[PDB]
Amino acid sequence: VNFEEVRELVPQKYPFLFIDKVIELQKESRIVCLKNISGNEPFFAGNFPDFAIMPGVLIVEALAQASIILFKKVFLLASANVRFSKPVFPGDQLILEIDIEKVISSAAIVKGVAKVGDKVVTKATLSFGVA
Amino acid sequence: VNFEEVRELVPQKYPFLFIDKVIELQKESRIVCLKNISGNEPFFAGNFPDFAIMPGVLIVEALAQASIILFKKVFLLASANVRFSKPVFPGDQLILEIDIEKVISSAAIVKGVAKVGDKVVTKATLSFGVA
Amino acid sequence: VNFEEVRELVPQKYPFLFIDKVIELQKESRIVCLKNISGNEPFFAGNFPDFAIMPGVLIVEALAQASIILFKKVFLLASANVRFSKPVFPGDQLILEIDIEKVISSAAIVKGVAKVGDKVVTKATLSFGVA
Amino acid sequence: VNFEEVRELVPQKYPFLFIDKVIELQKESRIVCLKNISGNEPFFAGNFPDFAIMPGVLIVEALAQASIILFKKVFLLASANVRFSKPVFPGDQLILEIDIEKVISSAAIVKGVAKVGDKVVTKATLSFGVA
Amino acid sequence: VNFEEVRELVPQKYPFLFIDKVIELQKESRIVCLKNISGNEPFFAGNFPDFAIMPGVLIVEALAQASIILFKKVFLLASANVRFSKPVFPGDQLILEIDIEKVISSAAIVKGVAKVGDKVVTKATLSFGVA
Amino acid sequence: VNFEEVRELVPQKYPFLFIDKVIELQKESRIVCLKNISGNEPFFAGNFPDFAIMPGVLIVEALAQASIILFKKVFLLASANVRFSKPVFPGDQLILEIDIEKVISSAAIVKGVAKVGDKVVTKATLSFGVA
């Protein structure tokens, strides 16, 4: 899955698109997404202008958009249980791993793991409604 | 506390500032913040261009920035346990209520409630580290 | 009239859309519009970075876009006679009241009143051509 | 007066700076300003995406910022009486002519004329307060 | 050729559109383009905030987009041999002169000359592929 | 060299900063820079909205900013001889290799090679003046 297929499946767009490409797919099982962290992104201007750090809530959004890609292969975040372990900086390559716990007809609960290299930077349990 | 005092205490800035003014303060107890939701904000262009809805993760950030105001009256989100109850639209006036559970020397855990009018739209438990 | 109906009737869009919702309608008589003033709007960065104040000309544009909503329920500002009474700040809720003086086949002249709470911040007489 | 002296005297900045250079100066008498109209300006995206036309209220702001340059050689628009004669498009070179009617200790009233080539596109009478 | 015909022929758009209008056309021979340089363009914020100078690579892009207009009257820059002679500032009117050396079925090589007034600011030889 | 040292040495800033971190340094010999290509960068909206491709001239700017880092360890692009070999897409990791040919007191000529993985995407010879 390339970038044109990302913009098609992810309902968000610039400046709120936080998926760059698709690394590994396993329909109804696991997805591994990739987002490049660049200092030329607009939110780096506004989140701590003294020193560039990626906001933790945007990592949660990146995990949510990756989960949506797994689903469509109208979802909406119903809940999030997140721990922010380590910071992400410009130049980092954020790996987004999504594992489905199990899916019902109107809801889905997933495991979210964000990594830079092999260091875990964010773990999350996300639930989605339908509208 | 006015807007010039908001930009001073909130380390974020545009386009990632999500506090407009300060409604009610109770140092080391409760804060009630206000953020205006306007269709002229940049994220509305990118989050569902078909229909404007405020991303849930940005409400979590608004609750986090309001908690930071309560604290400074270097914090960093360590965890978040959030349920997104109802959507927020352009024209809504987001009320952000923060209640401290209790604070230790190096961490803080708060209750977060986001409201439009009196309908609760987001409830959250947030924890903060120090760096 | 909701926000999706606002973007449909107002020919402007981001970052030059200055109407959030529709409070009161009286076709061919009066309209009462609402615009939320938020510090996260792009023009606040550039208009006096030392202290956030909403430019007066953007209030005139908000009154003009509200008048256009009243009309379509191709107009173009032909003239404006405005007095700027008091400033508007982030967090303010701008009320836009438009009263038609009377409409001819090719022109319209309206009364424009911008309010925060009940304090009048801007009064204007606007005329529109057709193209 | 060059562009670095423009940003110094004009309290506005990007994306609300509407003066590019200074053509002719006559302290306490007349100023002739220049603003380049380019399709790469942010407001052209949002004002009529079907066809690029410069909003009339931004011409009023350009005339106001030019008047401020004449003054400082804390002003704030108190009133504006404007007629919008003809449209301005990307590629146009907007000439801004300001003539002081006369100045008192706490207020100033000026004549504003915006031109492209020699066609008058906007005439205005502006008044300024002090704060 | 007006601005609506520019956006139609130039595949780029905001904030990467660097052609404002069309001054002189000679199909399969010469084109003379116009781009207004304004301090209100987004790249002026980021290229030397101490003093506004237009990046040289954006002049090369303006010459490339002007060459594309000459062609379509799917091209892609294959090579560029450029010398940057003198700087361009806000308020300058950039003239872009393109002369075809000769065109084959799958490639084109042109002469590019950027001028402000009659001073040459950029000379370039550009080649284009097809995809 | 980290990102805070990049913003210090590179005179450009957002939205015209095209260096994320520093991989390998050899003062007065070679530098290897890194820029993450993300679909959330502003120029991707405007360069071919149908399909995201990084403009070739921005790769030249990335090579120029990397050369400036090598130098300061007031330069200005005097000339560029570039061949654009293969496209760069969102998600790519652009490697920027700069080799000094030799430096005189008032000018510098370098070899520029941009790579994604090990595929060469851009080769360039750049010369810099001083002001």
Kindly report the CATH number assigned to the domain that includes residue D29. Answer: 3.10.129.10
B105: distance to nearest CA of chain C, Å?
32
Which residue, chain included where needed, has tokens 């709470």? Answer: C117
**Angle between the N-to-C axes of helices C56-71 and D56-71, in degrees from 0 to 180, rounded to the nearest 10:** 160
Which are the contacts of F76, defined by CB distance < 8 A and separation ≥ 6?
Answer: E84, F128, F129, F130, F131
How many residues in total does chain E contain? 131
CB D30 within 8 A of CB D98: yes
What sign has the CA pseudo-torsion A63, A66, A71, A72?
Answer: positive
CB E44 within 8 A of CB E91: no
CA–CA separation, C68 and E102 (whole Å) = 52
Largest distance between two CA atoms of chain B: 46
Query: Are A93 and F7 an interchain contact pair (Cβ–Cβ within 8 Å)?
Result: no
CA–CA separation, F107 and F130 (whole Å) = 7
Residue D36, Cβ density class (10 Å: 0-12 exposed, 13-18 middle, ≥19 buried)? buried
- Experimental method for this entry? X-ray
Query: Are F11 and E48 an interchain contact pair (Cβ–Cβ within 8 Å)?
Result: yes
At E56, is the secondary structure helix, strand, or coil? Answer: helix
Largest distance between two CA atoms of chain D: 46
Q: How many Cβ atoms are within 10 Å of B37's Cβ, its own excluded?
A: 25
Q: Which residue of E has its CA nearest to D23?
A: E91
Bridge-partner residues for A43, per DSSP? none
* Three state DSSP letters for chain B: CCHHHHHHHCCCCCCCCCCCEEEEEECCCEEEEEEECCCCCCHHHHCCCCCCCCCHHHHHHHHHHHHHHHHCCCEEEEEEEEEECCCCCCCCEEEEEEEEEEECCCCEEEEEEEEECCEEEEEEEEEEEEC
Cα–chain center distance at B25: 14
Bridge-partner residues for E24, per DSSP? E32
Q: What residues of chain B lie within 8 A of the CB of A45, using their CB? A: 13-15
Q: How many Cβ atoms are within 10 Å of C100's Cβ, its own excluded?
A: 18
Which residue, chain included where needed, has tokens 């001028």? Answer: E115
The secondary element (H helix, E strand) that includes residue F111 is strand F108-116
F105: distance to nearest CA of chain A, Å?
32
Query: Are C46 and D81 an interchain contact pair (Cβ–Cβ within 8 Å)?
Result: no
Which other chains touch chain C, taking contact as 3+ CB pairs less than 8 Å apart?
Answer: B, D
Q: In what order do the strands lie in the sheet with D30-36?
A: C21-26, C30-36, C93-103, C108-116, C119-130, C75-84, D75-84, D119-130, D108-116, D93-103, D30-36, D21-26
What's at C68, amino acid-wise? Answer: I
Name which of E19, E1, D109, E59 is nearest E10 in CA terms: E19
Q: What are φ and ψ of residue B102, in 5° steps?
A: 180, 155
User: Number of A:B CB contacts under 8 A?
Assistant: 89
Which are the contacts of E114, defined by CB distance < 8 A and separation ≥ 6?
Answer: E59, E62, E63, E88, E94, E95, E96, E97, E120, E121, E122, E123, E124
CA–CA separation, B98 and B83 (whole Å) = 15
Give the alpha-carbon dihedral of B71, B72, B77, B79, to 10 degrees: -10
Q: Which of B34, B40, B93 sits opposite C15 (nearest CB)?
A: B40
CA–CA separation, B91 and D33 (whole Å) = 38
What sign has the CA pseudo-torsion D118, D120, D125, D126?
Answer: negative
Cα distances (Å, whole numbers) of residue B73 to B9, B30, B31, B130, E33: 9, 11, 10, 16, 58
CB A36 within 8 A of CB F116: no
How many residues in total does chain F contain? 131
What's at C120, amino acid-wise? Answer: V
Q: What residues of chain C lie within 8 A of the CB of D12, using their CB? A: 46-48, 55
Q: How many Cβ atoms are within 10 Å of B75's Cβ, its own excluded?
A: 18
At F6, is the secondary structure helix, strand, or coil? Answer: helix
Query: Are A41 and F41 an interchain contact pair (Cβ–Cβ within 8 Å)?
Result: yes
Q: How many Cβ atoms are within 10 Å of E52's Cβ, its own excluded?
A: 25
CB D25 within 8 A of CB D1: yes
Which residue, chain included where needed, has tokens 């986001």? Answer: B114
Bridge-partner residues for A7, per DSSP? none
Pairing of strands D30-36, D21-26: antiparallel
Query: Are E34 and D91 an interchain contact pair (Cβ–Cβ within 8 Å)?
Result: yes
Which two tokens mark E82? 């450029």
State how many domains chain A has: 1
Cα–chain center distance at B106: 21
Instruction: Among A4, A7, A36, pick the best mutation site for testing chain F contact (most F Cβ within 10 A).
Output: A36
Cα distances (Å, whole numbers) of residue B17 to A117, B3, B65, E57: 30, 11, 8, 33
Which residue, chain included where needed, has tokens 């349990």? Answer: A125
Angle subtended at Cα B37 by Cα A52 and Cα D58, rounded to the nearest 5 degrees: 85
The secondary element (H helix, E strand) that includes residue B56 is helix B56-71
Q: Which of F15, F77, F80 sits opposite E43 (nearest CB)?
A: F15
Q: How many Cβ atoms are within 10 Å of E1's Cβ, its own excluded?
A: 17
Largest distance between two CA atoms of chain C: 46
At A83, is the secondary structure helix, strand, or coil? Answer: strand
Bridge-partner residues for C119, per DSSP? C116
Q: Do chains D and E touch (3 or more CB pairs under 8 A)?
A: yes
Which are the contacts of B49, defined by CB distance < 8 A and separation ≥ 6?
Answer: A13
Pairing of strands B108-116, E93-103: unpaired
Cα distances (Å, whole numbers) of residue D42 to A93, C14, E39, E105, F107: 30, 9, 12, 38, 37
Cα distances (Å, whole numbers) of residue E51 to D7, E44, F25: 10, 9, 29
Q: What residues of chain B lie within 8 A of the CB of C2, using their CB? A: 89
Bridge-partner residues for B122, per DSSP? B84, B114
Which residue, chain included where needed, has tokens 């009048």? Answer: C120
F74-93: b or e for each residue (b if 16 or more CB lie within 10 Å)? Answer: ebbbbbbbbbbeeebbbbbb
Q: How many Cβ atoms are within 10 Å of D62's Cβ, its own excluded?
A: 26
B43: distance to nearest CA of chain A, Å?
6
Verify cis geometry, omega within 30 degrees of 0, for the bond prior to A15. yes
Distance separating the N- and C-terminal Cα atoms of chain E: 26
CB B62 within 8 A of CB B33: yes
Angle subtended at Cα E42 by Cα D40 and Cα D10, rounded to the nearest 5 degrees: 105
Q: How many Cβ atoms are within 10 Å of F118's Cβ, its own excluded?
A: 6
Bridge-partner residues for C22, per DSSP? C33
Cα–chain center distance at C36: 11
Q: Which residue of C has its CA nearest to B15?
A: C40
CB E127 within 8 A of CB E108: yes
Q: How many Cβ atoms are within 10 Å of C85's Cβ, its own excluded?
A: 15
F-proximal residues of A, 12-71, CB under 8 Å? 14-15, 17-21, 34-42, 44-45, 51-52
Pairing of strands B75-84, B93-103: unpaired
Query: Are A40 and F39 an interchain contact pair (Cβ–Cβ within 8 Å)?
Result: no
What sign has the CA pseudo-torsion F9, F15, F21, F26?
Answer: negative
Q: How many Cβ atoms are within 10 Å of C4's Cβ, its own excluded?
A: 12
User: Number of C:D CB contacts under 8 A?
Assistant: 89
At E33, is the secondary structure helix, strand, or coil? Answer: strand
Angle subtended at Cα F53 by Cα F49 and Cα F58, rounded to the nearest 5 degrees: 110
Q: What residues of chain E lie within 8 A of the CB of F12, using their CB? A: 46-48, 55
Name which of F121, F128, F114, F122 is nearest F32 in CA terms: F114
Region of A90 (left: φ > 0; alpha: ψ -120 to 50; beta: rest) is beta
DSSP chain C: --HHHHHHH-S--TTS----EEEEEETTTEEEEEEE--TTSTHHHHS-TTS----HHHHHHHHHHHHHHHHT--EEEEEEEEEE-S---TT-EEEEEEEEEEE-SS-EEEEEEEEETTEEEEEEEEEEEE-
C82: distance to nearest CA of chain B, Å?
23
CA–CA separation, D63 and D124 (whole Å) = 8
CA–CA separation, C119 and C127 (whole Å) = 24
Which two tokens mark F43? 């120029």
Largest distance between two CA atoms of chain A: 46
CB B111 within 8 A of CB B125: yes
Q: What residues of chain A lie within 8 A of the CB of B11, using their CB? A: 48, 50
The parent domain of residue F24 ranges over 3-130
Name which of E34, E52, C57, E98 is nearest D89 in CA terms: E34
CB B96 within 8 A of CB B82: no
The secondary element (H helix, E strand) that includes residue F122 is strand F119-130
Distance separating the N- and C-terminal Cα atoms of chain C: 26
CA–CA separation, C20 and C6 (whole Å) = 7
Cα distances (Å, whole numbers) of residue F86 to D80, E18, F83, F124: 55, 23, 9, 13
Provide the strand spans (E) within chain E. Answer: 21-26, 30-36, 75-84, 93-103, 108-116, 119-130
Region of A48 (left: φ > 0; alpha: ψ -120 to 50; beta: rest) is left
CA–CA separation, A16 and E85 (whole Å) = 40
E107: distance to nearest CA of chain D, Å?
29
Which residue, chain included where needed, has tokens 């692009």? Answer: F77
Query: Are E45 and F14 an interchain contact pair (Cβ–Cβ within 8 Å)?
Result: yes
What sign has the CA pseudo-torsion E22, E26, E28, E29?
Answer: negative
Name which of C62, C107, C108 is nearest C82 in CA terms: C62
Query: Are B78 and A82 an interchain contact pair (Cβ–Cβ within 8 Å)?
Result: no
A17: distance to nearest CA of chain F, Å?
6
Which two tokens mark B121? 């739209």
What sign has the CA pseudo-torsion C30, C36, C42, C47?
Answer: positive
